Amino acid sequence: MVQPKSQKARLFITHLLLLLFIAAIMFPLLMVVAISLRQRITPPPFPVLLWLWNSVKVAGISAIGIVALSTTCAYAFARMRFPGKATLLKGMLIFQMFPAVLSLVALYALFDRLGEYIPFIGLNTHGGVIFAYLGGIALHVWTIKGYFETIDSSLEEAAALDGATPWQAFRLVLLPLSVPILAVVFILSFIAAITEVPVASLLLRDVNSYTLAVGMQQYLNPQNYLWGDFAAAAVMSALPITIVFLLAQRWLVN
Amino acid sequence: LFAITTLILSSAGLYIYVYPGMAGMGLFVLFPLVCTIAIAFTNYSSTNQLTFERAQEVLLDRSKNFTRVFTDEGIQKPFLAIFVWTVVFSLITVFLTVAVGMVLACLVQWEALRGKAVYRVLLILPYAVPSFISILIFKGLFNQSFGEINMMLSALFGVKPAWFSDPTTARTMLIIVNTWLGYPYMMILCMGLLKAIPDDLYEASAMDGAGPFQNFFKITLPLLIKPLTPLMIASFAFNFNNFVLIQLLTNGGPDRLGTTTPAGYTDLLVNYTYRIAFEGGGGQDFGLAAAIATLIFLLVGALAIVNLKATRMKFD
Amino acid sequence: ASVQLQNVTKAWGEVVVSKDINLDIHEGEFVVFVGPSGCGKSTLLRMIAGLETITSGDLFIGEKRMNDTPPAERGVGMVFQSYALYPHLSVAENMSFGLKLAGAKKEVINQRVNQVAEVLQLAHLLDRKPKALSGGQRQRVAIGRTLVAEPSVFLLDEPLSNLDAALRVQMRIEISRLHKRLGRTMIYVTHDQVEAMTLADKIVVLDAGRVAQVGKPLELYHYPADRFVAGFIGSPKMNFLPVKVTATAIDQVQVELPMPNRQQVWLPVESRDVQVGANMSLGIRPEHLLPSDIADVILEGEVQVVEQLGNETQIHIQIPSIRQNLVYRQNDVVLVEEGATFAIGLPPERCHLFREDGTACRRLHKEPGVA
Amino acid sequence: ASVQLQNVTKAWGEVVVSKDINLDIHEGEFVVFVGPSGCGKSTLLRMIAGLETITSGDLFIGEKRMNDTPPAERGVGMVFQSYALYPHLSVAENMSFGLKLAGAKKEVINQRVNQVAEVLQLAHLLDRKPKALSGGQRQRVAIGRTLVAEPSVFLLDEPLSNLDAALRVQMRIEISRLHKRLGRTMIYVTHDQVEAMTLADKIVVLDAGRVAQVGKPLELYHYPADRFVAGFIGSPKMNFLPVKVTATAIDQVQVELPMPNRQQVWLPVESRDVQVGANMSLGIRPEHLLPSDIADVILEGEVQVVEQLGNETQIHIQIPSIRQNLVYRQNDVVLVEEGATFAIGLPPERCHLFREDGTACRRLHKEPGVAS
């Protein structure tokens, strides 16, 4: 467009002030820099390395369960009409997006019961943790279905012609189509798992199978150059986050 | 209690299989909710998960609930200070997050300020690294004595104030922390949403003459209120009930100082809840019926309202 | 692949937009339909394929009934308002889709496809995919999914609505080329007065979900069914106005226009059931509306519009004592500033008329190309 | 005001769309551009209004030269491609938009609008909102915004684009009333050669930004600029074919058709610039092609197709060996089963032709309405 009307004036003020903004909300990360020495005669320290590896084990399989469920269950919701569809979705949305406070209360009670009969998934474990998260589909089914419908119908119609039962029509035909969402859910599922805290903390007794989420928390008592080790952990933190946060960035298709 | 639930389900599952798949959803997600608010105390002063059945067991082989909630005034006093705080925390929090998100967004695509792309990646990062690792270093910065934080503070300016200590300054500690934690979500929602608007429209504005400021206030802003709302208020539901941020930065510390049970100034509603369950010391009062009930219920008021405005949407 | 209907119907519960329609579309035909929006035109299409259901009445194809069996076992075919293309797979695969689906006869696949693909000018875009193409090409290859298969019927819900002029036309012949070539049946919704008239063996002037009429091209034009049909088809609307049928006879039927003079005049209409004094309604077109001199039947008034268009002119003309202005086609130009006076020839034989309840004053007066 | 332009130009950097165009749109006119898509006609209108840059050359709006000026100042306004409607504000408010911001005084504001709203046939739809209306109603009011304001110069990047048969026309004529009544300037753009000719005080056959030609509706039709100009404005496209400029002189130009007939023949040509042996190209519309019998210029050939357009007819037609087929309009019926033969006459006068390049041979044949 045209714009003689004091162009330079707005550009500088906008531009500069903009600079100030990033800079400030940057100092914090910056100091993290202002240290980074992980691994007289001292040694070992609280083992973040394994912590990180676990976070992946947690987040990875965690997401898989999320998508498997949000997608399959949702399938019934969008296409296959049935008894009371509008109301339940109505419910799951509201129902779950609760402030998971004391969600733990029942949880501890429940998992206690679980661990005894059904080993492994019980308290203190990887599998026990993933199971907890699963109820997260509610937000997702809503999105997974929403994209579903946007693609046009007939495509199925022609196919219905040539024998694609619900699944063949769904999988071969429909799903690879609706894959973009699969990633969205998968990636986002991945991040929450890592940025977990209440649940992971609670179930996971052991020192070893902590998540990166659990273990770095500790450096609260011995502040003062112990904290320094924490910066290093942050270093270990930027790798997964910077990377995966970044990969997803390209996704802004158009 | 578990014996009870599986009772109805067994009959239901075999009968209608379909039920079993759903059972897992209802059992894991839904069931805890039920016990959570319901069981939410009764006998459990700090002496009764079990019952007389077990009493036989302990002694032999040696060889109510919610009432607590409303029924208050004397006990019920710590609760009010936090509610006010917690609530206000969420409003002011949301208020700022957005002021930044949209304001930030507008400028991103102002076409003119070239290099929009680079500023974009950086503005986002707060979000990139977690909240978890992020806020921890945050505390470490914010030590009263320690932390390069006050360090520069005292250095350049006069003072170097009481982050953890004084309650007043402490509260502000969190608001801003979330500002840095929270603006990205507002930025991104706003960035994508702002897009929808008709480019030309602004051109209209051009003919009549105004902005960019007039653009923001007159045009775009009072035209992003509606889209934003289902989201902004709902997130607020979450903000109020922001358990995690509070815990690591400051267990509400400083303390309130009159608090019979495990209370605290900064301590949002949730924190208070969790503490008088645990957090050192046995059954101080392992029976948060009031705490449990209000939580599940008040938020729903938000849940229902969220649902009202939104409901799937446009093409615009 | 004959086909037909029998007091068919539909009714989204309350919404009964398919009130006992009927038809009998033989083999080889290439029928088509038309109608303002609220067509319900698509509806039929679907009813026909299978993608909907037969609320009432009945239907057939081949000859046997078929509400029952699915779209698949009917050998029907189509191309939607959308376009209906498989986003993921390429052109080669998309078309190749129907056939390979349970019997990969590769030899037949390539031959028929390229043969066809080539025809709609689409040999090169073999590997590419949906997005990787212009607006026109998809619509093109698309017609080809059905084409590749080689069904029997060929429904067509507007694969030409969204486009430029020459394309509509060329493909138009393409269709007529193939149909004439293959000759299987071929329904087709639309709007294009033009496509409509030009293409079809027969037609169906739908209306709020009902069989207003059917007929060959001109039949619709010259011999309209009712007030709606004539008004709809051809160039501008078929000008119209009031009347007061002074007299009658079996064949003819006299009339008396509303203006001051009351120039009555005869006209080769139906007559049976045509009491005198009734409030009839005199239909006629602009193409026909002759000049001042030739016929007797004057028609003065005033010059509303003045549409140049080089290859003709078409001056409008608000005749006194009537609501409707008067359109006015005619070959070659004719200077005549606006507001100025004017008038023209009421060619009686051509004319038209219809009762209060709007029905067809079945014009007796024959004409060419009207077996 | 007496708008105009001179050696204007543009080029999205490398991409030189505009191309030292020019014009002289004095007051009272209502020119209208047109051409195929990608014309970027849109661009030109924009440059003038202001809502885009003035890459080179210049432009004015009567006693001024608003290259370097905001859109708002040049006393302008216009209804856009979309429409430009405030989803938020209703009819009453959205309309009283332009006046509202810069100005003041409720009284002048309201009356002004209702006056217009009335004409727009929208006194009633005062209150109701934007989304809440028909396809056409949106555009109607849209027009009203620019209107209420009265920014001297009414531009219009394709308003009647998205609509039905009748409305196109109705709103069209209305524009006409507005223009004539007011008499203010009024540029415009679109496609419907029809719309074009109809409103058109003068015009401009665009072509990849360049000014192929200028003119009256008729001048365009009868007196084309070249192959392109003719090719555009014509119900079906105009007909065409090879040739071989057999000879020439003072005010005629022989030529002949590429096949057995050999029928050389004159034509009321400009003659200027016409070497012999010149493989030129013979233009002529279906609108002119007289019958088989009457004229001299015989032209027998097999029949290709038959558009029974009822209120007339037409027929494609493959001459013994011309490249593409011939075309053929005419009034009334014409049963004529295909495959069989048929033919017709090339009267000369109503004709056209041009050089290897494309520039046209001005014509002699003093046609209708066309003052010189």
Report yes or no on A131 lying in a domain.
yes
Residue A190's region, left for phi above 0, alpha for psi from -120 to 50, else beta, is alpha
Q: How far is D206 from chain C (nearest CA, A)?
A: 18
SS3 string of C117-159?
A: HHHCCCCHHHCCCCCCCCHHHHHHHHHHHHHHHCCCCCCCECC
Q: List CB contacts (< 8 A) between A98 and chain B.
A: 33, 296, 299-300, 303
Q: Is A179 on the interface with C (CB under 8 A)?
A: no
Q: How many domains does chain A have?
A: 1
Other beta carbons within 10 angstroms of residue A134's beta carbon come to: 17
Provide the residue type at C190 as one letter.
T
Closest approach of B223 to chain D, Cα-based (Å): 7
Write out the residue range of the structural domain in which residue A149 sits. Answer: 9-250
Contact predicate D275/D305, CB 8 Å: no
Question: CB C310 to CB D173 under 8 A?
Answer: no
Residue type, B234: A
Q: How far apart are CA C140 and CA C118, in angstroms?
A: 11
Q: Which residues of C touch D290 (CB under 8 A)?
A: none
Query: Do the Cβ atoms of D84 and B201 come within 8 Å?
Result: yes
Could D69 and A1 be called an inter-chain contact, meaning their C-beta atoms sit closer than 8 Å? Answer: no
Q: Which residues of D touch C308 (CB under 8 A)?
A: 197-198, 217-218
In angstroms, what CA-CA distances link C270 with C212, C220, C354, D159?
19, 17, 10, 46
A163 and C145 in contact by Cβ < 8 A?
Answer: no
Determine contact, residues C78/C49, Cβ cutoff 8 Å: yes
User: Was domain C238-287+347-362 assigned CATH 2.40.50.100?
Assistant: yes
Inter-helix orientation angle B289-309/A85-96, to 10°: 130
- Residue ranges matching CATH 2.40.50.100 in chain D: 238-287+347-362
Q: Which residues in A lie closer than 8 A to residue C47 (C-beta atoms)? A: none
State the best of D86, D138, D153 to mutate against chain B, taking most chain B CBs within 10 Å: D86
**D86/B201 CB distance under 8 A:** yes
Test A155 with C101 for CB contact under 8 angstroms: no
Cα distance between residue D313 and residue D75, in whole Å: 49
Q: How many beta carbons lie within 10 A of that of residue B236, not counting itself?
A: 20
Q: How far apart are CA C315 and CA C334, in angstroms?
A: 9
**Please, do chains B and C touch (3+ CB pairs < 8 Å)?**
no
Task: Name the CA radius of gyration of chain A, rounded.
Answer: 24
CATH label of the domain that carries residue A230: 1.10.3720.10
D71 interfacial to chain A (CB closer than 8 Å) = yes
Contacts of D197 in chain C (CB under 8 A): 308-310
Cα nearest neighbour of D131 on chain B:
B316
| Maximum pairwise Cα distance, chain D | 80
Report the amino acid identity of residue C313. Answer: T
Say if residues D319 and D301 touch (Cβ distance below 8 Å): yes
User: Which residues 6+ apart lie within 8 Å of D204 measured at CB?
Assistant: D23, D31, D32, D33, D34, D211, D213, D214
Q: For residues C85 and C132, give the distance between their C-alpha atoms in angstroms, rounded to a whole number.
A: 12
User: If you measure CA to CA, which chain A residue comes closest to D54?
Assistant: A2
- Does A153 map to a domain? yes
Structure tokens at B146: 């320690």
Topology of the domain covering C297-345: OB fold (Dihydrolipoamide Acetyltransferase, E2P) (2.40.50)
Hey, is C15 helix, strand or coil?
strand
Task: Confirm if D259 and D321 have CB atoms less than 8 A apart.
Answer: yes
Give D273-292 as a DSSP string: S--SS---EEEB-TTT-B-S
**CB-based contact (8 Å) between B203 and chain D?**
yes
CA–CA separation, D232 vs D225, rounded Å? Answer: 11
Distance of alpha carbon C146 from the chain centroid: 23
Q: Which residues of B touch A194 (CB under 8 A)?
A: 130, 132
What is the b/e burial string over C142-154, where b = at least 16 CB atoms within 10 angstroms of the residue's CB?
A: bbbbbbbbebbbb
CB pairs under 8 A between C and D: 63
Q: Which residues contact B92 (CB under 8 A, 6 or more apart)?
A: B175
Mutation target vs D (from C174, C238, C288, C309; most D CBs, 10 A cutoff)? C309
In chain C, which residues fall in CATH 2.40.50.140?
A: 297-345
Are the C-beta atoms of C315 and C307 separated by less than 8 Å?
yes
Tokens of B267: 């301590």
CB contact under 8 A, C333 and D307: no
How far is D155 from D61, CA to CA, in rounded Å? Answer: 13
Q: Which residues contact D311 (CB under 8 A, 6 or more apart)?
A: C221, C234, C235, C285, C287, C329, D331
Q: Closest residue of C to A151, CA-based?
A: C87
CB-based burial, C174-183: b 16+ in 10 Å, e otherwise:
bbbebbeeee
List, in sequence order, every residue forming a beta bridge with D301; answer none if it has no partner.
D342
What distance in Å separates the CA atoms of residue B137 and residue B147, rounded to the nearest whole number?
Answer: 10
Name D132's Cβ contacts closer than 8 Å, sequence gap at least 6.
none
Closest CA to D92 of D55, D69, D124, D63: D124
- Please report, in range form, the residues annotated as the binding site of C for ATP: 35-42
Chains that touch C (3 or more CB pairs under 8 A): A, D
Contact assignment for D102 to B316 by CB distance below 8 Å: no
Measured distance CA(C286)–CA(C346) in Å, rounded: 10
Q: Which chains touch A (3 or more CB pairs under 8 A)?
A: B, C, D
DSSP-derived secondary structure for D12-71: BTTB--SEEEEE---TT----EE-STTS-HHHHHHHHHSSS---EEEEEESS--GGGS-T
CA nearest C307 in D: which residue?
Answer: D198
Tokens 């801003």 -> residue? B176
Burial class (CB in 10 A: 0-12, 13-18, 19+), A212: buried
Residue with tokens 């709006």: D61
User: What distances in angstroms separate CA D170 from CA D84, D134, D151, D195, D251, one per listed residue?
Assistant: 21, 16, 24, 11, 45
Interchain CB distance below 8 Å, A4 and D52? no
Distance from CA of D51 to the nearest CA of A (A): 5
CA-CA-CA-CA torsion for C261, C264, C265, C269, nearest 10 degrees? 140
Which of the other chains make 3 or more beta carbon contacts under 8 angstroms with chain B?
A, D
> C213 in helix, strand or coil?
coil
Domain boundaries for CATH 3.40.50.300 within chain C:
1-237
Give residue limits of the domains in chain B: 2-69, 78-309
At how many degrees (to 10) do helices C91-100 and C135-149 cross? Answer: 20
Contact A226, A66 (CB under 8 A): no
Reduced to 3 states (helix: H, G, I; strand: E, B; else coil), residue D249 is strand
CA distance C370 to B32: 81
**CA separation for the pair A243, D59 (Å, rounded):** 53
Distances (CA, A) of C165 to C37, C172, D326: 21, 11, 18
Chain A positions touching D48 (Cβ under 8 A) are none
* Single-letter code of the amino acid located at B266: T
Q: Residue C294 corresponds to which tokens in the numbers above?
A: 């030739």
Which chain D residues are within 8 Å of A1, Cβ to Cβ?
A: 51-52, 71
Taking the C-alpha atoms of residue C142 and residue D278, their distance in angstroms, rounded to an integer, is 45
Q: Which of B200, B207, B223 lies at the smallest CB-CB distance from D82? A: B200
What CA–CA distances, in Å, run from D155 to A2, D62, D76, D147?
17, 16, 8, 11
The two tokens of residue A120 are: 């492994």
Beta bridge partners, C205, equal C34
**Six token digits for residue C368:** 């060419």
**The CATH number of domain C1-237, selected from 3.40.50.300, 3.40.50.410, 2.60.34.10, 3.60.21.10:** 3.40.50.300
The span from the CA of B201 to the CA of D82, in Å, is: 9
Torsion sign (Cα): D188, D191, D194, D197: positive
Residues 192 to 211 of C: which have CB under 8 A from any D CB? 194, 197-198
Which amino acid does the sequence have at A70? S
CATH domain B78-309 topology: MetI-like fold (1.10.3720)
C285, C331, C368: residue with CB nearest D335: C368
For tokens 């138009």, name the residue.
Answer: C172
Cα distances (angstroms) measured from residue D163 to each of C80, D137, D139: 22, 11, 10
Judge whether D331 is closer than 8 Å to chain C, CB to CB: yes
Helices of type H across D314-367 = none
The one-letter code for the residue type at C79 is: V
Q: How far is A5 from chain D (nearest CA, A)?
A: 7
Q: Do B203 and D101 touch (CB under 8 A)?
A: no
B198 close to D (CB below 8 A) = yes
* The two structure tokens encoding residue D154: 């009414």
Q: What angle do CA A227, A231, A234 make, to 5 degrees?
A: 130
Q: Does A3 fall in a domain?
A: no
- Least Cα separation, residue C55 to chain D (angstroms): 32
The total number of residues shown for chain D amounts to 372
Cβ–Cβ contact D55 with A under 8 A? no
Note whether C353 and C302 are within 8 A (CB). no
Name the residue among A166, A169, A146 with its Cα closest to residue A78: A146
Buried b (16+ CB within 10 A) or exposed e, D6-34: eebbbeeeeeebbbebebebeeebbbbbb
Question: What value does the CA radius of gyration of chain D take, rounded to a whole number of Å?
Answer: 25
**A206/C contact by beta carbon, under 8 A:** no
| Residues in chain B whose C lies over 2.5 Å from the next residue's N (breaks after) | 16, 63
CB pair distance less than 8 Å for B133 and A233: yes
Query: Phi and psi dihedrals of B273, rounded to 5?
Result: -55, -65
Element (H, E) at D177: helix D165-182
Q: Which of B197, B202, B207, B215 to mutate to test the interface with D (most CBs of D within 10 A)?
A: B207
